[PDB]
Enzyme design. Structure first.
Site, mmCIF file in Angstrom:
data_model
loop_
_atom_site.group_PDB
_atom_site.id
_atom_site.type_symbol
_atom_site.label_atom_id
_atom_site.label_comp_id
_atom_site.label_asym_id
_atom_site.label_seq_id
_atom_site.Cartn_x
_atom_site.Cartn_y
_atom_site.Cartn_z
ATOM 1 N N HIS B 1210 0.817 -1.208 0.000
ATOM 2 C CA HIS B 1210 0.000 0.000 0.000
ATOM 3 C C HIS B 1210 0.853 1.261 0.000
ATOM 4 C CE1 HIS B 1210 -3.429 2.591 0.698
ATOM 5 N NE2 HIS B 1210 -2.850 3.087 1.776
ATOM 6 N N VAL B 1211 2.103 1.162 0.452
ATOM 7 C CA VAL B 1211 2.978 2.326 0.514
ATOM 8 C C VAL B 1211 3.621 2.599 -0.840
ATOM 9 C CG1 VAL B 1211 4.889 3.364 1.782
ATOM 10 C CG2 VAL B 1211 3.366 1.735 2.920
#
Ligand SMILES: *P(=O)(O)OCC(C)(C)[C@@H](O)C(=O)NCCC(=O)NCCS[C@@H](CS(=O)(=O)NC[C@H]1O[C@@H](n2cnc3c(N)ncnc32)[C@H](O)[C@@H]1O)[C@@H](N)CO
Ligand SMILES: [Cl-]
Lengths: 66, 1231
Positions: B1210-1211
């Site tokens: 997600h980063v």
């Protein structure tokens, strides 16, 4: 000094080729072939005064055709 | 003073006939004993010991040897190749007597050089023969003809105390005052002394009879003065030096005093030789002969005396001209005597003796240093003298300046080097770019940080702009000035101007407004292309139409306009003029076409090559950066502005695009290598396939240092602006680089349809290795100077070797090498090349002499500080002023005035006032007397680190603020090391351009939109709205732009502080409906294209449905790993923390006012706890991170889910490496 064209006390012919281009030639050198004498030997500033009044087709809008 | 050299003079007399050997040996002892000078002794002290005796010569009989002659030479060589002691009372004399036959004898004689010389030793040989002959008659030993050593010493003290001395001293004092510097037939430097006494002897007899015919036409000319006039001319012509210092053999003793002396006698004295080009050979022979007559009245003066009142510095003269003949004749009854010379002594350079014989012919004897000359090249030079003489025998009215000294095999070698004729098509730039665009319309062509164009897309934009230029009155043959930042639109503008049949005039916006207006009044362009930010500066310019080009236009076909013609002017580059005003160089269309077609033929480019555009548009090097990749199929990438000055930003730029081809100035290449480590050299320069250097003398040591770091081929190019970019080429890598003997890489061989001349002052060619004036011929010459017929006729002169054609005067001094390559040597004018920047010192002086109350002004280039001389060109411009009233000038206020007239690089860094301008006895301004500039609120606490950084690089302790970095000796190459050093001592980045605008301890210490709307890329067509994440800034959407069609605009909206939507909202719908105010006002009616990522994803999926309450349609809704808020919750606080960690790590730790960043996360967490997902029945696009059930979790809030897989977290789903795959998906969906 060194180059004969940088001599401010030098005399210079003013020559012209078939394409209407002007070249200074130092009085002390043998004249080059393919050029006609237009002016007799004049001063550095005298050649500057003649050239600015007789060669004004030297702009990019003058090379637009031939 | 010091013990002398111990080299001896050796000779043998070849006697033929009956010789009484033990009598002649006894006559040697009798003869040597008469001369008490031969009993001289050295012990430092020098004196005469009359207690010394002479031993009989050892007689040797080689008649029964296998080779009597050869063995006799070895005997005389074995004694001659031994170093003489000079110590002890050992008489420094040696005689031998070797018998070669019954009637043939070799009488070897050796003397130390302080006992006899070449003129006085025959006197001793003749006296020994007189004693011998006298005894053979039965008569006593003859008296001593020599004068004793005491009488010759008092003879000298008789002199030196007289009025002849001081009169001779005053003559040779004024002689060395106007004595020109020495010349040499060897290209090697001239040493002060010479070790080897073993030399190269050459005797040549001219049997052509040309000299005999020359002297019979010049009857009144003495043959010795005539032959000497020939040599004086022959040496000056071969060295291309009409003024040079030579040596000449005089005599310190004359009359009987010379015939009586034991020696030495000869006296080599300086001789200034002037070759007047307009003179004839008789006039030169007359002036030269009249000059020696005046010198002979002072020839008694000592030569070692001229040196004392004048170590290993340069000598006074080089060549030595000898006109004397020495009498070796002996008269022994019925015995033939012939003297053969073995050891004359050491020569420093070249000794030339000329012998006109009784019959009128001419023979010469050449002695030469074996380190500076060899056998064949002397024969070659003596051949030039043979034709020198022949040309005056044909026409004795010939001028000395027009005489030809070049051999027939060198005219042919110059005809081979200039055989560059290559048929090129009669085409233009627009036809070549349109040709390649038809071949590869889909390939990538042009790209910067926000754009990437294909070839078809590029031609659509060029034709669109060229039609807009026509709509604003740009007809074929006009000029268009361009003042644009470095981007894709700079490249597009130039192609569009050529497409319209016009020439472009690049403008540096860093120049002051008074110079730009002066440039625009001289060129008078029909239109000016700039940006809205640079527009208010040209308001003072009358009669000038403007056009703002900063966004792509609507495309309407790519068909070429066919307005360009080969005779049209392509571009106008302005340079500095020696009269004060700049001059524009108009380069024709055909001239630049030939330069590029050769560039692509000699250094081929392909479709996988990446050319970098980093050269400022003012420099004509950029001309081939803007077009060469587009006649080949390569890709052209725009560097950031101000990045050509930063080596570190250049390293990132090379690795970012995978640049293959680029250019460098040798000063920048030296500063780039200085920032490189082999680890970084393979992380940025690994993709380089070929690199070009031009503009300066390229040091070979730098190329080898560049070859070790990268191994990428390097090429040296040379040429002025008047010759269309570059006129010659030479490899600067591999085998050619290892065979370079000089300090700089040669400028090389001529390009296509181009010639090189290298001529003298009389416009005659010069032999190889000899310096001359460089001229340029060929199809690449400029049309001339814009508005300046006087300058054109002065620099673009007639060509005497090509009737009717033209030839450009470079002002460069060059010479030919043995492989035909040209080596640059220097300039012949006051034009300088500082770090590649063409600067005319004449212009800077004219502007300073127009300053208020300035009588005299001089500009000078020097290295102010020697601690800054590490690599590159460290020169600075220092101005020297003289006030007309004598009052102080306040130079700092004059320096500020100059900055409103001259470009930043032509403004002197220091202005120093002088009482009187330091002239010399000449009156020619001694530039070595010009004083270098010497090296107040004390530093501070924050500027104490930068003030300590100056002391490191500048090598001088700077303790008081307002210390100018440049006035202390710093330059823009050292500012790159300065900014790189502060960036490690500060958490914030420092660019070398920050030092430029503010060079001061305290002024440099004082030195991504934050608004609601972030204009990422403003195009023309549809607008893609990117919503901010939890940080509240759409900065991370910068990498999406390049993957989209250039017509697409990209506007990210965000939430700033204070007075921001995230800080003021109680509900997430209060802000979700607050961005509906900024989004709906700029697109009142759709369709809409929305992208989210994380908090922006739920912020878009709420607006995407609040818009479906309208009224308009939502065409694209993209979500980057977004989840509905129904999925306080833990573990998601560890995720958005990683969002905060990654967001802050990409800001380089700059800045602090950015408590706004962490503040927004704090107001984001409390906003995510009251959230609610809205229906939105339409279709949306999902990008999911595989490393962290997307279908059912979104099912009842988006009926349609197309989804795409990516291996990330997600980063890192918004990372630039992830958009490498996500990016093209949005483009493919948006159409
Ligand atoms: P700091 O504030 O001083 O900044 C440092 C840097 C390096 C960043 C700054 O100086 C900079 O940006 N420099 C770039 C300078 C540049 O790109 N110049 C264009 C190159 S010269 C140009 C024609 S010219 O008339 O201006 N120069 C011709 C002139 O130069 C000499 N020359 C050219 N090539 C030579 C070689 N190979 N050897 C020796 N000398 C050479 C000649 O005297 C010639 O007359 C281009 N046509 C050159 O390709
Ligand atoms: Cl220079």
């Amino acid at each position: 000094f060194s180059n004969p064209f940088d001599d401010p006390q030098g005399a210079f012919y003013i020559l012209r080729n078939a394409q209407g281009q002007f070249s200074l030639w130092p009085q002390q050198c043998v004249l080059p072939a393919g050029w006609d004498i237009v002016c007799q030997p004049q001063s550095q500033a005298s050649c500057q005064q003649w050239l600015e009044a007789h060669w004004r087709t030297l702009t990019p809008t003058n090379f637009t055709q031939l | 003073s010091e013990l002398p050299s111990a080299w001896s003079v050796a000779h043998y007399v070849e006697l033929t006939g009956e010789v009484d050997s033990p009598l002649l040996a006894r006559a040697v002892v009798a003869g040597l004993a008469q001369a008490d000078t031969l009993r001289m002794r050295f012990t430092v002290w020098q004196w005469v010991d009359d207690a010394l005796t002479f031993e009989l010569p050892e007689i040797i009989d080689l008649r029964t040897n296998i080779d009597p002659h050869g063995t006799a030479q070895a005997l005389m060589q074995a004694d001659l190749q031994q170093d003489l002691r000079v110590d002890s009372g050992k008489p420094l004399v040696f005689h031998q007597l070797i018998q070669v036959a019954d009637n043939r004898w070799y009488w070897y004689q050796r003397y130390h050089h302080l006992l006899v010389d070449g003129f006085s030793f025959p006197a001793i040989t003749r006296q020994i023969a007189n004693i011998y002959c006298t005894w053979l008659r039965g008569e006593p030993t003859p008296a001593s003809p020599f004068t004793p050593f005491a009488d010759v010493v008092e003879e000298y003290q008789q002199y030196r105390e007289s009025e002849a001395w001081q009169r001779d001293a005053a003559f040779w004092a004024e002689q060395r005052r106007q004595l020109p510097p020495p010349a040499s037939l060897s290209p090697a430097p001239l040493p002060g002394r010479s070790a080897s006494a073993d030399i190269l002897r050459l005797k040549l007899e001219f049997t052509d009879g040309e000299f005999r015919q020359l002297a019979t036409q010049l009857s009144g000319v003495q043959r010795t003065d005539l032959a000497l006039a020939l040599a004086a001319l022959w040496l000056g012509r071969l060295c291309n030096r009409m003024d040079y210092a030579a040596g000449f053999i005089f005599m310190r003793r004359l009359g009987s005093a010379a015939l009586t002396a034991t020696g030495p006698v000869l006296n080599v004295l300086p001789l200034g030789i002037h070759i007047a080009a307009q003179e004839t050979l008789p006039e030169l022979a007359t002036r030269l002969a009249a000059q020696l007559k005046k010198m002979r009245r002072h020839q008694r003066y000592d030569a070692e005396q001229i040196v004392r009142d004048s170590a290993g510095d340069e000598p006074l003269f080089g060549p030595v001209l000898n006109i004397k003949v020495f009498d070796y004749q002996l008269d022994i009854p019925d015995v033939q005597a012939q003297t053969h010379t073995l050891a004359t002594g050491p020569v420093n350079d070249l000794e030339l003796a000329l012998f006109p014989d009784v019959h009128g012919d001419l023979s010469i004897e050449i002695l030469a240093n074996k380190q500076r000359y060899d056998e064949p090249t002397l024969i070659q030079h003596a051949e030039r003298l043979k034709m020198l003489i022949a040309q005056f025998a044909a026409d004795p009215a010939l001028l000395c300046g027009d005489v030809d000294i070049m051999l027939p095999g060198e005219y042919a070698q110059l005809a081979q080097l200039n055989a560059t004729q290559v048929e090129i098509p009669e085409t233009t730039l627009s036809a070549l770019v349109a040709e390649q665009a038809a071949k590869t319309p889909d390939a990538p062509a042009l790209a910067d940080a926000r754009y990437l164009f294909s070839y078809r897309e590029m031609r659509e934009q060029v034709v669109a702009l060229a039609n807009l230029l026509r709509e604003r009155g740009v007809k074929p043959g006009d000029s268009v000035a361009v003042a644009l930042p470095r981007s894709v639109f700079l490249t597009l503008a130039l192609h569009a101007i050529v497409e319209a049949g016009a020439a472009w005039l690049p403008l540096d916006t860093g120049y002051p407004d008074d110079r730009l207006k002066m440039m625009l009044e001289d060129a008078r362009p029909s239109l000016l292309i700039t940006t809205d930010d640079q527009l208010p500066r040209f308001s003072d310019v009358p009669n000038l139409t403007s056009l703002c080009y900063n966004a792509p236009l609507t495309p309407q076909g790519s068909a070429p306009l066919q307005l360009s013609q080969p005779h049209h002017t392509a571009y106008i580059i302005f340079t500095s003029g020696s009269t004060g005003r700049p001059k524009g160089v108009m380069v024709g269309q055909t001239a630049i076409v030939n330069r590029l077609l050769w560039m692509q033929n000699h250094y081929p480019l392909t479709g996988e090559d990446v050319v970098a555009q980093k050269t400022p548009c003012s420099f004509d090097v950029s001309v081939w950066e803007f077009f060469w990749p587009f006649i080949a199929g390569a890709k052209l990438v725009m560097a950031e502005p101000e990045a050509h000055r930063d080596p570190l930003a250049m390293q990132q730029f090379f690795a970012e695009y995978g640049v293959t081809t680029t250019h460098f100035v040798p000063s920048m290449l030296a500063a780039f290598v200085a920032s490189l480590t082999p680890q970084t050299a393979r992380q940025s320069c690994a993709t380089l396939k070929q690199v070009f250097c031009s503009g300066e003398a390229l040091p070979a040591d730098l190329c080898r240092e560049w070859q070790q770091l990268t191994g990428a081929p390097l090429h040296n190019l040379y040429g002025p602006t008047e010759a269309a970019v570059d006129v010659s080429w030479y490899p600067a890598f591999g085998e050619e680089l290892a065979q370079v003997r000089g300090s700089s890489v040669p400028i090389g061989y001529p390009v296509w349809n181009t010639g090189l001349r290298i001529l003298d002052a009389m416009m005659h060619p010069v032999p190889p290795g000899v310096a001359g004036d460089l001229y340029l011929t060929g199809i690449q010459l400029a049309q001339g100077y814009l508005g300046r017929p006087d300058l054109t006729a002065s620099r673009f002169i007639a060509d005497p070797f090509a009737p009717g054609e033209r030839m450009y005067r470079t002002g460069d001094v060059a010479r030919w090498l043995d492989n035909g390559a040209v080596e640059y040597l220097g300039r012949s004018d006051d034009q300088l090349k500082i770090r590649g920047q063409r600067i005319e010192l004449g212009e800077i002086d004219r502007v300073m002499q127009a300053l208020p109350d300035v009588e005299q002004a001089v500009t000078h280039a020097c290295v102010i500080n020697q601690a800054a001389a590490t690599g590159g060109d460290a020169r600075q411009l220092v101005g020297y002023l003289v006030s007309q009233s004598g009052l102080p000038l306040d130079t700092s206020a004059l320096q500020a005035q100059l900055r409103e007239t001259l470009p930043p690089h032509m403004v002197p860094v220091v202005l120093l006032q002088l009482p009187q301008l330091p002239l010399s006895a000449n009156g020619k301004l001694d530039r070595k007397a010009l004083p270098l500039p010497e090296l107040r609120a004390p530093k501070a606490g924050s500027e104490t680190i930068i003030a300590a950084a100056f002391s490191s690089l500048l090598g001088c302790d700077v303790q008081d603020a307002d210390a100018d970095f440049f006035a202390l000796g710093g330059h823009s190459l050292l500012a790159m090391k300065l900014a790189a050093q502060l960036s490690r001592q500060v958490a914030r980045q420092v660019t070398p351009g920050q030092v430029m605008v503010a060079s001061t301890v305290a002024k440099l210490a004082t030195i991504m939109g934050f608004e609601t709307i972030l204009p990422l890329r403003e195009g023309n067509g549809p607008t893609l709205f990117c919503f901010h994440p939890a940080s509240g800034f759409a900065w991370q959407f910068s990498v999406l732009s390049r993957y989209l069609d250039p017509q697409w605009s990209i506007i990210g909206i965000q939430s700033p502080r204070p007075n921001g939507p995230m800080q003021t909202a109680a509900n997430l719908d209060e802000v979700c409906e607050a961005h509906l105010a900024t989004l709906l006002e700029q697109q009142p009616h759709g369709p809409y294209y929305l992208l989210g990522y994380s908090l922006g994803g739920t912020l878009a999926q709420g607006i995407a449905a609040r818009l479906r309450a309208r009224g308009e349609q939502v065409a694209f809704l993209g979500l980057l790993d977004t989840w509905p808020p129904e999925t306080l919750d833990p573990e998601v606080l560890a995720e958005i923390n990683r969002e905060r960690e990654a967001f802050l790590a990409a800001q380089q730790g700059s800045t602090e006012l950015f408590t706004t960043i962490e503040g927004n996360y704090a107001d984001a967490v409390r906003l995510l706890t009251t959230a609610h997902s809205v229906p939105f029945d339409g279709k949306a696009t999902l990008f999911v991170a595989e490393r962290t059930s997307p279908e059912r979790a979104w099912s009842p809030w988006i009926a349609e889910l197309d989804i795409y897989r990516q291996d990330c977290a997600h980063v890192d789903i918004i990372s630039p490496g992830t958009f490498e795959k996500i990016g093209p998906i949005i483009r493919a969906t948006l159409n």
